[PDB]
Amino acid sequence: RFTSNIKGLTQAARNANDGISVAQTTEGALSEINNNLQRIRELTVQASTG
Amino acid sequence: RFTSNIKGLTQAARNANDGISVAQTTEGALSEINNNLQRIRELTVQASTG
Question: Chain A partners of B38 at a C-beta cutoff of 8 Å?
Fold first, then answer.
């Protein structure tokens, strides 16, 4: 039973590592989208002037 | 009567030895069946992740 438990826990640890990886990828993409929206806000602030 | 008894007991001991043999063989086979099921459990724990 202990062998089963330790093998399962190790594999679950690797799975959690993969989860951290996918979270990192999504966060990087979102950070870039944030930069793009920031530049769009620059352009809006400039264009609002008459 | 004593001679008949001692011969019978000797043959009985030999039979019990044969029984120990068959039990050992069965236990070895069951041991590796357990090993394979353990690996299956590890694989399933891996496969449960999304």
Answer: 3-4, 7
Alpha-carbon gap, residue B12 to A17, rounded angstroms: 61
> Does residue B46 contact residue A17 with C-beta atoms inside 8 Å?
no
Q: How far apart are alpha carbons A6 and A12 in whole angstroms?
A: 10
CB contact under 8 A, A4 and B41: yes
Resolution (A): 4.2
Please give the structure tokens belonging to residue B38: 């353990």
CA distance A5 to chain B (A): 9
Cα radius of gyration (chain A): 22
- Mutation choice for B interface testing from A2, A6, A10, A15 by most B CBs within 10 A: A15
Query: What technique solved it?
Result: cryo-EM
